[PDB]
């Protein structure tokens, strides 16, 4: 059903030292609290004269099929990592949230301080303070330039051994390289993102409907003002309806460290 | 032949978010377009007079 | 220059321009003039840079 | 260590999560400590003791 509910915990007890033999004992309590799941859907419509479904090089509907799969992937994604026209009822988006948390760390330091490379194995940092640990690496085409470039202060290779030389791992883990185009890589100082790193395992996504696929033989196509654009039986014309139902979560624990929630987060960026 | 033909894929579909549990479902087309591949030509003639032939 | 890795590394950019319009090239082509230019890969005490990939 | 769990052979561990003294003026901070643990004894007269309460 359209949501789900899971309960967490929100403080901890505490220990006291005793005044000698005869001093009073102290008190604490435990609290819970909860946090949500909710759902949302996408869906797409296309119309085609029939005529021209029969004179057709090739059969469409197993041409185009790929393609739209893609699409309903990629909207996805974008709205997730970004916040790009987002739902209002879904979490904050990974990139603004990764910020809010101080998590982002501005790429830029010397070779003498290790390169590039150093700017990486700060932003583990980051993480591993927060009391998580990372698993695999996010990034746009742009970090291959980055990676490729990391010299050492008379030129040579930094670090030699501990990138794969097919660009596919660091340090053991394993890197790749979705939404390819999306990326934010042009504009002013800091609005610019190259790679993410984090804990994976803590983020949840549930589908509540797969893509489901309907015919369309005799419905009528409107725009918002309730105006006819098409008359789909009368002018000899087919269409296809195409749905989703998704929604996703983050579980951001309390822990010992970093206990103050609004300075955690699972993972930390490198960004221009 | 003089010239040869090419398909290919001009533009993508797009999907979008459903307002509330009811709005109206909007929609997008496909498109292909073509390529061509000409034909053109490399000559020379080279003259000689026949007694440096002999 | 030279502590960027000299010539190496301006062919490591090339790589990224390629990349980043969406391929990944598979072969290179020169003016005979490349080859003095690429024996000259020196490191900034005169060494080779990046001694294995040539 | 590839593990950050060893140096030099010796072992390495990180108890107190969250506790160490990391913010303050010059020479107030602490990051770790080296030593010869041998040498340093403790004794428990009795366990956690547990006792419920009504009146």
Do not use: H
Not at 114 to 133: R, S
Not at 237 to 264: I, K
């Amino acid at each position: 059903r359209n949501q789900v509910r899971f309960p967490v915990l929100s403080a901890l007890p505490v220990a006291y030292w005793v005044n000698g033999d005869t001093g009073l004992k102290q008190t604490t309590e435990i609290n819970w609290t909860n946090k949500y799941l909710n759902i949302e859907e996408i869906a797409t419509i296309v119309p085609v004269p029939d005529n021209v479904l029969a004179d057709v090089d090739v059969n469409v509907w197993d041409e185009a099929m790929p393609y739209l799969i893609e699409a309903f992937g990629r909207t996805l994604d974008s709205a997730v990592v970004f916040g790009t026209n987002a739902p209002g009822t879904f979490p904050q988006a990974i990139v603004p949230a990764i910020a809010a948390a101080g998590n982002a760390v501005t790429e830029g330091s010397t070779a003498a301080q290790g390169g590039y490379l150093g700017d990486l194995d700060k932003a583990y940092g980051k993480v591993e303070e927060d009391g998580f640990e990372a698993n695999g690496i996010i990034a746009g085409i742009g970090l291959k330039g980055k990676l490729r470039g990391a010299r050492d202060a008379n030129g040579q290779k930094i670090d030699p051994t501990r990138v794969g030389a097919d660009l596919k791992s660091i340090d053991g883990l394993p890197v790749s390289y979705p939404m390819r185009g999306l990326w934010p890589s042009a504009g002013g100082a800091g609005t610019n993102v190259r790679a993410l790193v984090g804990d994976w395992s803590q983020f949840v996504v549930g589908v509540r409907q797969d893509i489901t696929l309907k015919v369309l033989d005799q419905a009528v196509i409107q725009d918002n003002t309730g105006a006819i654009i098409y008359n789909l039986a009368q002018q000899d014309m087919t269409a296809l309806r195409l749905t989703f139902r998704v929604g996703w979560q983050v579980a951001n624990t309390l822990n010992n460290d970093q206990p103050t929630e609004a300075n955690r987060y699972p993972a930390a960026s490198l960004i221009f």
